[PDB]
Write an enzyme that holds these catalytic residues in place. Structure first.
Site, PDB file in Angstrom:
ATOM      1  N   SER A   1     -11.233  -2.157   1.432  1.00 47.85           N
ATOM      2  CA  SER A   1      -9.811  -2.152   1.756  1.00 47.85           C
ATOM      3  C   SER A   1      -9.564  -2.504   3.216  1.00 47.85           C
ATOM      4  O   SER A   1      -8.487  -3.000   3.555  1.00 47.85           O
ATOM      5  CB  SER A   1      -9.208  -0.785   1.445  1.00 47.85           C
ATOM      6  OG  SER A   1      -9.524  -0.401   0.125  1.00 47.85           O
TER       7      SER A   1
ATOM      8  N   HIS B   1      -2.999   4.910   4.974  1.00 46.68           N
ATOM      9  CA  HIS B   1      -3.841   3.734   4.780  1.00 46.68           C
ATOM     10  C   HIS B   1      -3.091   2.437   5.080  1.00 46.68           C
ATOM     11  O   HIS B   1      -3.653   1.516   5.686  1.00 46.68           O
ATOM     12  CB  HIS B   1      -4.386   3.729   3.356  1.00 46.68           C
ATOM     13  CG  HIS B   1      -5.410   2.671   3.120  1.00 46.68           C
ATOM     14  ND1 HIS B   1      -5.151   1.529   2.389  1.00 46.68           N
ATOM     15  CD2 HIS B   1      -6.704   2.579   3.527  1.00 46.68           C
ATOM     16  CE1 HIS B   1      -6.243   0.783   2.350  1.00 46.68           C
ATOM     17  NE2 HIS B   1      -7.196   1.398   3.039  1.00 46.68           N
TER      18      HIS B   1
ATOM     19  N   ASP C   1       0.839  -1.200   0.000  1.00 50.49           N
ATOM     20  CA  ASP C   1       0.000   0.000   0.000  1.00 50.49           C
ATOM     21  C   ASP C   1       0.876   1.253   0.000  1.00 50.49           C
ATOM     22  O   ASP C   1       1.813   1.332  -0.802  1.00 50.49           O
ATOM     23  CB  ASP C   1      -0.965  -0.104   1.190  1.00 50.49           C
ATOM     24  CG  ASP C   1      -2.191   0.789   1.039  1.00 50.49           C
ATOM     25  OD1 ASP C   1      -2.085   1.991   1.338  1.00 50.49           O
ATOM     26  OD2 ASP C   1      -3.255   0.309   0.600  1.00 50.49           O
TER      27      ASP C   1
END
Ligand SMILES: NC(=[NH2+])N/N=C/c1ccc(/C=N/NC(N)=[NH2+])cc1
Ligand SMILES: NC(=[NH2+])N/N=C/c1ccc(/C=N/NC(N)=[NH2+])cc1
Ligand SMILES: NC(=[NH2+])N/N=C/c1ccc(/C=N/NC(N)=[NH2+])cc1
Ligand SMILES: *[C@@H]1O[C@H](CO)[C@@H](O)[C@H](O)[C@H]1NC(C)=O
Ligand SMILES: [Ca+2]
Ligand SMILES: [Ca+2]
Ligand SMILES: [Ca+2]
Ligand SMILES: [Cl-]
Ligand code: NA
Ligand code: NA
Length: 466
Positions: free
Chosen positions: A259, A85, A44
Site C-alpha cells: 500500500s 492510512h 482510502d
C-alpha cells in the site's frame, strides 16, 4: 533546482539516496518536473486536509467523503488511529517541500486529494462512486484495496466498479483516460497469488509491487503475471521504511507494505504527466514497461521475454525510474488505437485430472481490423470446475516462449467453485508478436486425486499493429 531542505528528507532513502538504490526522482526534479498542474487522489480512509505538510497542496476538487456522503474527507479520529492510512499515502505523493516539516512528496508541487471511502460499508456503489470521482479534474487515482488477502478468495470489481473503470479509461481526462495506480496486494504470508484479485489483475489498473531496501521480495508481496512494475517499501527490521505525513499533524518513519508502493508510483506518474500532458492511460503503461529497471532486485524468476526485456512475477519489469520516465515522455508518440482480438480456443470440454495441456496456433485476427502484431496485455479467460481450487497451478506460454504464471498453488484455497470466465492477465509478453502457438498448462500440484473439467478457454489479445 535545489535539493529539499525538509528535516526528514535525508530519511527518505528511496528518494534522497546516492547509492543507486532509489527511484531516481532527483533526476526528474532536476529536469524541472515536480508535478505542477497534476491532480492525484488517494482512494482510502480519508485525508487530513489541514496537515501542515499537505494543506499547501490540498485540492477539494480531488476529494470527497463517500462513506458519509459529504464533500469533506477528513478522517474519523480514533484512539488507535485506524484512519491514518490515506494521510500517509497522500504525503508520499505530494507532501510540501522546503517548508521545515517532515519530508517531501515525489510530486511535491502536485495537487492532492482524498476520497474517504474505506471507513464504512464498502459496496460496489461505494467503489464506483470513488473511482468515478471528478474524472475530468483528477488525473491519477491511487488505491490498495480489493478482495481479502487471505489466499483463498477469487473476486474483482462488480458491475458498477467495472463500469467505472471503463468509463474512466475511455472518457476520463478528456478522453485520454484516468490513470488508476494499484497495489498488487499484501497476501504474501498467506501464499496469495494476485491474479485472483480482479482489481490488480485488470488491464485498466497500472499495478505495482514492492521491494525492500536491500533489494529483496518482502514477506507481504504477492507474485502474479498482471503486475507491471515495483517501488521500494518496507522489509525486515534492519531495513528502513517509508517516511511520510501521519494523522494528527505528525510525521511517521514506519509506513509499510505494498500500500505504500502504489502512492510512490502515483507520484512518479504525476511527474511524467507533467512532462507530457497528452499521454493516454495506455501510453503511461508503455512508458513503465520501457523504462523500469531490474538491476539489483533479487528474484529467482527473472526471465527474458520475446523482445529482450527481463520480467519477474514479483517485480514486473522492475523498479520505476522517474528520471527515465520523464525523459522518455517528452517526445513520446501516442500509441495507435487499442485493438482486441478474441480467440475462443476449445472445440470440446477437456478433463483436467492430474495435468492438462492445451495448444492452439492462432493468427491473431489476421486480415481483420483487430489484427495485432504488437501485444500489450493478454488474457486467458478460463471457465473450469475443480474439487480443490488451490491445488491448481496454471501457466500460459506465448509463441515467443514467454512462460507466464497465471495462477500459483494457493494452499489455503479449499474452494470447490472453480473459475467462472476468470480473465487471468499477463503483462510479460508486452510488445511481442502474438501470432503462432500458445500453450496453456493446468496442473494438480498436490498428490491428491483431484478432478475437474475445463469448459471454456478464450484467449483475448490487446494491442496494435504498428
Ligand atoms: N486485494 C486487496 N488489495 N485487498 N485489500 C484488502 C484490504 C483490507 C483491509 C483494509 C483496511 N484499510 N484500513 C484503512 N485504510 N484505514 C484495506 C484493504
Ligand atoms: N470486490 C471486492 N471484494 N471488493 N473488496 C473491497 C474491499 C475489501 C475489503 C476491505 C476491508 N476494509 N477493512 C477496513 N476498512 N477495516 C475494503 C474493501
Ligand atoms: N463477486 C461478484 N459478484 N462478482 N461479480 C462481478 C461482476 C462483474 C461485472 C458484471 C457485469 N455485468 N454486466 C451485465 N450483467 N450486463 C457482473 C458481475
Ligand atoms: C494529443 O495526441 C493526439 C493523438 O496523437 C493528437 O491528435 C493531439 O494533437 C495531441 N494534442 C496535443 C496538445 O499535443
Ligand atoms: Ca465528512
Ligand atoms: Ca515537507
Ligand atoms: Ca491478494
Ligand atoms: Cl474490452
Ligand atoms: Na493491473
Ligand atoms: Na525467453
Amino acid at each position: 533546482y535545489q535539493e529539499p531542505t525538509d528535516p526528514k528528507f535525508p530519511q527518505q532513502w528511496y528518494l534522497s539516496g546516492v547509492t543507486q538504490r532509489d527511484l531516481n526522482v532527483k533526476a526528474a526534479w532536476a529536469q524541472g518536473y515536480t508535478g505542477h498542474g497534476i491532480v492525484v487522489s488517494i482512494l482510502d480512509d480519508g485525508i487530513e486536509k489541514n496537515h501542515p505538510d499537505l494543506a499547501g497542496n490540498y485540492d477539494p476538487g480531488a476529494s470527497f467523503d463517500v462513506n458519509d456522503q459529504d464533500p469533506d474527507p477528513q478522517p474519523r479520529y480514533t484512539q488507535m488511529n485506524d484512519n491514518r492510512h490515506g494521510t500517509r499515502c497522500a504525503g508520499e505523493v505530494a507532501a510540501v517541500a522546503n517548508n521545515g516539516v517532515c519530508g517531501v512528496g515525489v510530486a511535491y508541487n502536485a495537487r492532492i486529494g482524498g476520497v474517504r471511502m474505506l471507513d464504512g460499508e464498502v459496496t460496489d456503489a461505494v467503489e464506483a462512486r470513488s473511482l468515478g470521482l471528478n474524472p475530468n479534474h483528477i488525473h491519477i487515482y491511487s488505491a490498495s484495496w480489493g478482495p481479502e488477502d487471505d489466499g483463498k478468495t477469487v473476486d474483482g470489481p462488480a458491475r458498477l466498479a467495472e463500469e467505472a473503470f471503463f468509463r474512466g479509461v475511455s472518457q476520463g481526462r478528456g478522453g485520454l483516460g484516468s490513470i488508476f495506480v494499484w497495489a498488487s496486494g499484501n497476501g504474501g504470508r498467506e501464499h496469495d497469488s494476485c491474479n485472483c484479485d480482479g482489481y490488480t489483475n485488470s488491464i485498466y489498473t497500472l499495478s505495482i509491487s514492492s521491494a525492500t531496501q536491500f533489494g529483496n521480495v518482502p514477506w507481504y508481496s504477492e507474485a502474479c503475471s498482471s503486475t507491471l512494475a515495483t517501488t521500494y517499501s518496507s522489509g525486515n527490521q534492519n531495513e528502513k521504511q517509508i517516511v511520510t505525513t501521519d494523522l494528527r499533524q505528525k510525521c511517521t518513519e514506519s509506513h509499510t507494505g505494498t500500500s505504500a508502493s502504489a502512492p510512490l508510483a502515483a507520484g512518479i506518474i504525476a511527474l511524467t504527466l507533467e512532462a507530457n500532458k497528452n499521454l493516454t492511460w495506455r501510453d503511461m503503461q508503455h512508458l513503465v514497461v520501457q523504462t523500469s529497471k531490474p538491476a539489483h532486485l533479487n528474484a529467482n524468476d527473472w526471465a527474458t521475454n520475446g523482445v529482450g526485456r527481463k520480467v519477474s512475477h514479483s517485480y514486473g519489469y522492475g523498479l520505476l525510474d522517474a528520471g527515465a520516465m520523464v525523459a522518455l515522455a517528452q517526445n513520446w508518440t501516442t500509441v495507435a488505437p487499442q485493438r482486441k482480438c478474441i480467440i475462443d480456443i476449445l472445440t470440446e470440454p477437456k478433463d483436467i485430472g492430474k495435468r492438462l495441456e492445451v495448444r492452439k496456433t492462432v493468427t491473431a485476427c489476421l486480415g481483420e481490423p483487430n489484427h495485432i502484431t504488437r501485444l500489450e496485455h493478454a488474457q486467458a479467460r478460463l471457465t473450469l470446475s475443480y474439487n480443490r481450487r488451490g491445488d491448481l497451478a496454471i501457466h500460459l506460454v506465448s509463441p515467443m516462449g514467454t512462460r507466464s504464471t497465471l495462477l500459483a498453488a494457493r494452499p489455503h484455497d479449499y474452494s470447490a467453485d472453480g473459475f467462472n470466465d476468470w480473465a487471468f492477465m499477463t503483462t510479460h509478453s508486452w510488445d511481442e508478436d502474438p501470432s503462432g502457438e500458445w500453450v496453456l498448462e493446468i496442473e494438480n500440484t498436490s498428490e491428491a486425486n483431484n478432478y475437474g473439467t475445463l469448459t471454456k478457454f478464450t484467449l483475448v489479445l490487446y494491442g496494435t499493429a504498428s
